């Protein structure tokens, strides 16, 4: 049906609007080009290769220390448990579509017996008013900048300041799900340190906008990080050797961190072209990062046929899937990376000329 | 004090009695030399690179299915929870020095709310009487072959059969901590499959006797493995890309699985040399695997000085550490691998003539 035809069409395209190209073994071998084969492996959380990377990212985030984790899934459940223990309160609060709530097979609930109170509604940004309306106290609030499931939306920076100030006054710990932190500094015109300064703890990824292989850093005060390392061993995350992910994380960080503004500008240019099409809009209308969602006023079956024809005729991958939203509405996500800049101008123009012609 | 002096002396040695050479980036480089840079990454537990490896190991172990985990610490906690749910019983039983009990910061207790009953006494092998004598129902019994903390001791295969048979009649799940399973097939003259046939589930490692970088396989019935995959995501172990560990595990498995008999022989010969020295004895007296413990009748500081001198004068690393057992008794562990055969005969002989002399 539509699903498989679109998938196949997308997979065959030489060019892609989204991403950083194929996730293949070459991503790792490229990262190892400048590394000495005699470089010693880290050993259960210790050693220059891991310690130097932790110290470096901690300094970039303006925190006392950091711990390298195999995943954000592990790291964030642990962060919330530490704050629950400090406050003797197993309730937390976050957006209904937090990664913890929907993408971790209920790990936070099942492994930590933490009860998440959902803030606002699934379709919009949470606000300070939602926090003020909580019917019981919480140990922490978790904020995801930007809110990926609603298209990568952000509150005004001044509103994040007000949330931070209120949490400080009420003794509520504030944790940053910064999976896509690097991608938002251009819009906010704030450094990573400035944004993270409003939070007690922060998690950042190296495989999202950075385009590395896998891995995460959790950062905060020394005492906090030391407790996180104990939990890391409990979770089976204190692997003997994490260098394959540390080296690749550091390589791709240095390769792509300077491109965040470029990806933001590119995403905005692309969104303008989508919005110019009849029956097509983006959310947000003007991207505030390298990502956005594209919505259509037609069913997924109908749009899939159009996208397949266009991908086949231009060689430019638009999307490998379409999410059904209502009877006659569907959508997909775009995250701009290195692939966008490789699309020849003619092919890119043709995609939209064709899109405008088919709908 | 001699602790760091010994450690530095050991790290400088070009040859070593134990292990498989330096744990450096080169280990990864070598494993990737014959992999196509275009080979596609696994994606959150799916894809040929991960699926083919899991299938390969499951067949070797004689089980329906297998799941690759980043760690045995995560894998085994999960295995025990699964059996605990099946039996509605959160009590388990194992040796007092099980890895779950002493090396995982109490993860089993803290994350899985399981109560472990300790079988027998810390200084010796648990027996079938210890199991039959429990007089309280448990969901599972865990067996570690060999028992590493007491020198790598093994019960007779015939006793394992009886333990398996008893647990089967009583409805008790039997789990194998097979971190060092590969190392014991020579002594038992039984295949991995024949050993695993006695157990409901099994965990095996790829970084110990195999000498890979990191990683584990958990294997058993397909329904058991599917539940394990749910828990894997909850733990933060379902990394987008595990190929760096999978490809290296497979590479070193192929390289060294056939040398297990050789390592066993070599260990026996090395233990004989240790035992022939006054003031020195191995546990077990005769190794039943590639490993054993070496005990001395002097203090860690006194032995540390001697080993430091011998290491500096011969270029052969004996031990990087000493574990104090009492004021005047200390010990270390030796696990024979590829390093041993690379020691020139002259140097090896000089090591023992010095040990004979100094003690
Ligand atoms: Cl703190
Ligand atoms: Na090189």
Descriptive overview:
- The structure is a homodimer of 359-residue chains.
- Chain A has 359 residues and is an alpha/beta fold.
- The first copy, chain A, has helices at 2-11, 26-31, 48-61, 72-87, 99-102, 107-112, 128-132, 157-170, 185-188, 192-196, 222-234, 243-256, 260-275, 300-314, 345-358; strands at residues 15-16, 65-69, 91-94, 115-118, 140-144, 173-178, 201-205, 216-220, 280-283, 291-296, 316-317, 323-326, 329-335.
- Chain A folds into two domains: 1-255, Aspartate Aminotransferase, domain 2, CATH 3.40.640; 256-359, Alpha-Beta Complex (Aspartate Aminotransferase, domain 1), CATH 3.90.1150.10.
- In chain A, the strands form three sheets. In chain A, strands 2-8-7-6-5-3-4 form a seven-stranded mixed β-sheet, with helices on both faces.
- In chain A, strand 12 (323-326) and strand 13 (329-335) form a beta hairpin.
- In chain A, helix 1 (2-11) packs parallel to helix 14 (300-314) and helix 14 (300-314) runs antiparallel to helix 15 (345-358).
- Chain A is globular, with a radius of gyration of 21 Å.
- Chains A and B meet through helix 2, helix 4, helix 6, helix 11 and helix 12 of A and helix 2, helix 4, helix 6, helix 11 and helix 12 of B.
- The complex binds chloride ion (CL) and sodium ion.
- Chloride ion is lined by residues 221, 223-224 of chain A.
- Chloride ion binds at residues 221, 223-224 of chain A.
- The PDB classes it as lyase.
Number of strands of chain A: 13
The CATH architecture of the largest domain in chain A: 3-Layer(aba) Sandwich
Q: Give the helices and strands of chain A as they follow along the chain.
A: HEHHEHEHHEHEHEHHEEHHHEEHEEEH
The largest inter-chain interface, given as chain pair and residues per side, is:
A-B, 50 and 49 residues
What's the CATH class label of the largest domain in chain A? Alpha Beta
Q: Mind describing the biggest β-sheet of chain A?
A: 7 strands, mixed
Q: How many helix segments of chain A? A: 15
Oligomeric state? homodimer
List the bound ligands.
chloride ion, sodium ion
Widest sheet, order of strands of chain A? 2-8-7-6-5-3-4
Assigned CATH superfamily of the largest domain in chain A:
Type I PLP-dependent aspartate aminotransferase-like (Major domain)
Structural class of chain A: alpha/beta
- Any idea what the radius of gyration of chain A is? 21 Å
- Rounded to the nearest angstrom, the distance between the terminal CA atoms of chain A is 21 Å
Shape of chain A: globular
Keywords (chains A, B): Pyridoxal phosphate
Cofactor (chains A, B): pyridoxal 5'-phosphate
Protein name (chains A, B): Lmo0305 protein
GO molecular function, one term (chains A, B): L-allo-threonine aldolase activity
